Amino acid sequence: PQLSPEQLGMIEKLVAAQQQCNRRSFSDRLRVTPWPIAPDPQSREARQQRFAHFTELAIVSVQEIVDFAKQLPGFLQLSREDQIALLKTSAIEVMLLETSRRYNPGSESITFLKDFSYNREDFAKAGLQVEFINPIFEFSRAMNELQLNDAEFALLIAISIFSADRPNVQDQLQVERLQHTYVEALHAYVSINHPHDPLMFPRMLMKLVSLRTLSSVHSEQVFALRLQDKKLPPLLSEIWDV
Amino acid sequence: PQLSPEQLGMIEKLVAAQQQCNRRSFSDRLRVTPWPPQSREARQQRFAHFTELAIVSVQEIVDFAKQLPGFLQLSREDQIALLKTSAIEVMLLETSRRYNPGSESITFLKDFSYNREDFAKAGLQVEFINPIFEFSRAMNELQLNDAEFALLIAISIFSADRPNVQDQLQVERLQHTYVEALHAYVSINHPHDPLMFPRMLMKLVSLRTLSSVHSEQVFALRLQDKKLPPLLSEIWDV
Amino acid sequence: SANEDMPVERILEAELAVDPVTNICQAADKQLFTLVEWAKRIPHFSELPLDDQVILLRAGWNELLIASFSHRSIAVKDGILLATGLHVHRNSAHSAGVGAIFDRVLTELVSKMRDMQMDKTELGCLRAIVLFNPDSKGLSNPAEVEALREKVYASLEAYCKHKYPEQPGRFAKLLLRLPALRSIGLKCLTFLMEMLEA
Amino acid sequence: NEDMPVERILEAELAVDPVTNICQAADKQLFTLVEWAKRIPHFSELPLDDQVILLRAGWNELLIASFSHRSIAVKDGILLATGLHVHRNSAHSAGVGAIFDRVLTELVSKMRDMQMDKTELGCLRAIVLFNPDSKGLSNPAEVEALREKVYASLEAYCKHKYPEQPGRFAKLLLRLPALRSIGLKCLTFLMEMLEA
Numbered sequence: 001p002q003l004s005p006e007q008l009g010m011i012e013k014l015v016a017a018q019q020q021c022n023r024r025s026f027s028d029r030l031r032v033t034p035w036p037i038a039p040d041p042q043s044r045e046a047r048q049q050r051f052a053h054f055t056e057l058a059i060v061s062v063q064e065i066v067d068f069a070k071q072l073p074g075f076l077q078l079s080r081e082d083q084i085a086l087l088k089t090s091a092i093e094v095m096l097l098e099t100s101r102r103y104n105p106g107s108e109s110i111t112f113l114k115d116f117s118y119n120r121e122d123f124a125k126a127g128l129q130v131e132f133i134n135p136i137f138e139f140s141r142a143m144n145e146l147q148l149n150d151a152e153f154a155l156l157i158a159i160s161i162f163s164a165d166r167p168n169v170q171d172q173l174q175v176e177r178l179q180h181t182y183v184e185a186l187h188a189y190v191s192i193n194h195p196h197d198p199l200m201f202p203r204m205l206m207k208l209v210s211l212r213t214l215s216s217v218h219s220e221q222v223f224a225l226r227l228q229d230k231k232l233p234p235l236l237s238e239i240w241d242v
Numbered sequence: 243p244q245l246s247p248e249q250l251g252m253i254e255k256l257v258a259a260q261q262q263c264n265r266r267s268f269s270d271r272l273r274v275t276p277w278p279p280q281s282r283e284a285r286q287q288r289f290a291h292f293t294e295l296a297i298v299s300v301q302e303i304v305d306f307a308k309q310l311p312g313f314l315q316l317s318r319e320d321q322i323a324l325l326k327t328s329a330i331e332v333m334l335l336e337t338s339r340r341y342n343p344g345s346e347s348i349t350f351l352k353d354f355s356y357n358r359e360d361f362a363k364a365g366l367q368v369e370f371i372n373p374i375f376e377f378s379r380a381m382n383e384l385q386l387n388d389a390e391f392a393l394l395i396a397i398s399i400f401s402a403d404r405p406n407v408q409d410q411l412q413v414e415r416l417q418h419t420y421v422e423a424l425h426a427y428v429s430i431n432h433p434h435d436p437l438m439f440p441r442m443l444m445k446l447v448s449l450r451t452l453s454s455v456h457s458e459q460v461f462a463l464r465l466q467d468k469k470l471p472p473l474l475s476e477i478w479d480v
Numbered sequence: 481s482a483n484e485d486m487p488v489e490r491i492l493e494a495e496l497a498v499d500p501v502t503n504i505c506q507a508a509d510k511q512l513f514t515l516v517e518w519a520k521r522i523p524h525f526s527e528l529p530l531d532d533q534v535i536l537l538r539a540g541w542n543e544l545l546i547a548s549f550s551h552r553s554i555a556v557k558d559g560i561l562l563a564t565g566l567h568v569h570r571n572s573a574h575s576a577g578v579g580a581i582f583d584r585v586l587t588e589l590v591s592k593m594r595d596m597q598m599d600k601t602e603l604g605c606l607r608a609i610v611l612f613n614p615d616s617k618g619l620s621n622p623a624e625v626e627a628l629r630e631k632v633y634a635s636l637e638a639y640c641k642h643k644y645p646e647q648p649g650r651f652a653k654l655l656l657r658l659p660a661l662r663s664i665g666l667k668c669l670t671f672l673m674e675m676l677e678a
Numbered sequence: 679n680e681d682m683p684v685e686r687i688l689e690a691e692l693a694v695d696p697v698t699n700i701c702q703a704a705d706k707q708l709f710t711l712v713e714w715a716k717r718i719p720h721f722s723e724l725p726l727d728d729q730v731i732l733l734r735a736g737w738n739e740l741l742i743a744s745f746s747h748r749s750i751a752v753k754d755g756i757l758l759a760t761g762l763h764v765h766r767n768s769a770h771s772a773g774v775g776a777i778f779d780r781v782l783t784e785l786v787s788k789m790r791d792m793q794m795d796k797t798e799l800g801c802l803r804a805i806v807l808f809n810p811d812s813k814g815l816s817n818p819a820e821v822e823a824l825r826e827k828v829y830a831s832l833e834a835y836c837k838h839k840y841p842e843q844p845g846r847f848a849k850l851l852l853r854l855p856a857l858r859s860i861g862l863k864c865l866t867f868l869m870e871m872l873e874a
């Protein structure tokens with residue numbers, strides 16, 4: 001009982017699509033507004049510039065997720081409104097998976113791009129509240145403890161994008177059929193590559209449950225930013241605002 | 243501007259009415275189920291105990307409200323509505339008046355003292371216990387006396403914006419009497435501390451929130467299948 | 481011994497032992513008392529510190545109730561059956577302006593349960609997993625609760641393999657309902673007169 | 679003396695479905711709260727963290743007081759910041775009538791009957807804003823101190839400005855419990871990117 005060629009092929013594509021999207025977006029890392037070096041905790045302006053930095057990288061992440069979704073067999077054959085329906089609601093969850101994948105347990109930070117580590121303090125300094133920061137860090141820590149590999153995050157990312165219950169999905173049955181294929185692949189993989197760690201599979205799926213909570217926490221964080229200056233740039237706005 | 247004989251007399255009547263309620267409550271203390279770690283029974287007995295106490299307190303508030311100038315002259319409809327929503331507020335003011343800053347405990351009916359743990363061991367949650375204890379400690383700092391508590395309680399009772407109040411106009415007139423008296427009273431007895439009065443009135447605002455936090459405590463106790471007895475339920479569930 | 485550590489038989493017993501909106505809230509209120517009665521019958525839960533039991537139920541209660549009436553609603557057509565015995569139809573839900581979240585309940589939960597014919601033991605296990613949520617704040621020992629939830633994973637999987645050996649993907653199909661449940665859950669969030677006159 | 683100029687406070691006030699019309703009104707005003715509180719004395723000297731906490735905690739009561747005052751004119755409803763109006767009857771038809779009336783009776787109506795003025799409304803909003811009980815405050819006592827400065831200044835203003843009405847100060851504060859209870863009950867590109 002092992003992975004079929006089809007599943008093997010499908011996983012190779014996913015892993016390759018991720019690395020390639022990763023570089024297709026690398027070509028503009030520093031093209032992002034820089035991280036302040038102002039030594040004033042009370043500066044509203046060092047603070048706005050940190051928020052701008054993040055919204056910029058967040059837009060680069062969105063583009064990358066869209067680039068990766070297009071590489072998913074079946075996605076492009078969905079209606080255009082369905083593709084959007086899936087992407088708008090899956091976006092934050094994929095970014096948080098991506099976040100947990102890059103969590104450095106030693107320094108308690110998240111590395112977004114070589115020498116781009118950020119801890120809890122760095123995020124508070126952009127004006128993000130503690131009820132948003134702590135759960136994400138707790139989540140990334142626990143995710144890191146599973147020690148998933150590239151194939152596993154990639155499968156997990158695809159399962160998340162192909163959720164039939166996102167608001168405004170028309171073809172729920174086609175979306176489910178698509179998702180079933182990845183879930184089935186993940187199961188075979190976990191069972192072949194973690195032969196003496198069976199709970200790995202249910203633990204991975206339960207992470208999809210936590211994501212729904214974190215998404216809700218994230219949307220509260222978006223409202224909170226409005227109570228300040230921080231409006232979201234136009235792309236992030238239609239995805240997340242309302 | 244000062245206090246007239248009439249206002250001094252009204253204040254005295256209030257303090258006397260509250261003391262009188264205290265003695266009858268105290269005299270009726272034996273009626274309450276006695277105070278008994280991972281035991282459910284013990285936890286349920288502590289909650290039974292507290293609800294019994296609270297019923298006794300509700301009787302105190304009603305007896306005291308029946309004695310307020312003009313209260314009976316309102317529709318029974320309005321009397322009920324004023325008591326129903328002011329109940330938890332008056333009880334929290336009474337709690338602050340009975341707060342012991344040393345042991346951080348509250349002493350009810352002369353010889354019943356409870357700290358944070360006691361309330362927790364009855365099953366009450368921390369998001370309820372903490373703000374009330376925080377409120378009591380802050381009130382206690384003000385060092386209000388009998389007169390000041392009696393008036394603050396009467397102001398709370400005569401709150402026109404309580405749900406289902408018919409003659410809001412008359413309720414505001416009644417309340418105004420006591421606010422006027424409290425102002426005069428602070429300015430005569432705390433001549434150098436005029437922020438006292440604003441500060442006291444602002445407690446009325448906190449009670450609004452604390453009332454809401456108590457509602458949440460009630461639906462939470464229900465998650466533990468601890469329902470309020472009939473009288474309490476009528477006041478606090480419905 | 482997976483089942484021995486978290487007997488699927490006990491979980492089943494736990495389940496056995498227990499305007500439209502206004503009517504739904506009423507039904508919910510009625511079902512509140514069943515939370516503690518259901519939970520004490522779930523293995524090992526009563527061994528948790530009383531404080532943690534309370535936290536677990538405070539955190540899970542709406543998801544627990546939603547799971548239950550959805551499963552009960554399998555027989556009804558385009559609606560739900562309340563614990564009070566009232567039916568609520570799709571049409572009446574939209575007219576009351578909750579048709580958005582109501583449709584999500586029907587298709588993500590009720591319909592899925594119907595089509596796979598999810599049984600009472602599976603439902604009970606899913607509810608046990610919701611119950612044993614180690615991520616609720618103020619838990620005296622989350623790792624304990626987490627160990628318990630993993631015992632439901634293992635016990636539920638063994639049961640699925642035994643009872644439904646032709647459906648290799650069933651276990652995962654049961655779990656794949658929890659995210660939808662979680663999101664639905666998030667979205668869903670005389671005497672006195674006597675004293676007077678006497 | 680008065681280290682909470684009512685002049686500045688009044689300046690700040692000056693500086694700025696039926697349900698959907700209100701929600702849209704709120705969004706338009708959400709983006710003034712920092713500029714309003716900016717103009718309140720001593721607020722900008724508070725730690726940035728705390729400022730966020732005070733607006734996070736105060737925002738809704740802050741917004742409610744304002745549109746309430748504005749609707750002193752309208753007979754049976756509110757003038758929104760959108761320029762639109764909401765009448766009682768459509769509020770009740772929608773389903774938020776009970777909360778609507780509270781606002782009309784306990785706020786709108788009361789502010790008219792006593793003709794509270796922009797300086798007064800503003801001092802009240804400053805009191806709501808300077809709320810030391812909000813969780814996560816770095817220095818509560820600091821905010822406490824600033825709230826009392828508004829007590830003092832508001833009183834002095836009332837005494838001098840309305841010396842015929844000796845109970846006016848107390849009358850303003852007694853609007854705040856109602857505000858609090860009301861406040862508590864009141865709680866394209868993707869397509870292009872896809873194609874390209």
Ligand SMILES: CCCCN(Cc1cc(Cl)c(OC)c(OC)c1)c1ccc(C(O)(C(F)(F)F)C(F)(F)F)cc1
Pocket residue numbers: 054055057058061095096098099112123128132133136137218221222225232236240
């Ligand atoms: C505290 C850590 C959470 C960071 N996340 C997730 C995330 C952020 C960025 Cl910038 C990514 O690009 C590198 C990413 O891909 C790995 C994942 C996060 C997500 C969204 C936001 C915001 O939506 C908001 F509003 F919450 F601040 C925004 F983008 F606006 F910053 C903030 C943090």
Ligand SMILES: CCCCN(Cc1cc(Cl)c(OC)c(OC)c1)c1ccc(C(O)(C(F)(F)F)C(F)(F)F)cc1
Pocket residue numbers: 292293295296297299332333334336337350351361366370371374375456459460463470474478
């Ligand atoms: C943590 C301190 C809260 C105590 N309070 C106020 C209070 C309680 C009792 Cl038993 C009194 O009897 C003397 C009293 O008189 C001054 C004041 C309190 C109030 C209500 C409850 C409850 O409504 C509930 F449900 F929250 F627990 C009840 F009465 F049921 F105990 C609990 C504590």
Ligand SMILES: CC1=C(/C=C/C(C)=C\C=C\C(C)=C\C(=O)O)C(C)(C)CCC1
Pocket residue numbers: 501504505507508511542545546548549561562563564578581582585668669
């Ligand atoms: C689903 C749903 C809602 C929430 C229901 C909840 C949270 C519990 C129901 C429990 C029942 C209905 C138990 C039973 O009857 O067995 C509300 C009203 C918010 C909106 C309408 C759709």
Ligand SMILES: CC1=C(/C=C/C(C)=C\C=C\C(C)=C\C(=O)O)C(C)(C)CCC1
Pocket residue numbers: 697700701703704707738741742744745757758759760774777778781864865
């Ligand atoms: C009052 C009210 C509500 C809340 C309104 C809030 C919270 C803010 C409005 C702000 C405005 C309207 C500011 C302005 O226009 O200046 C909701 C929607 C809950 C129900 C309808 C009644």
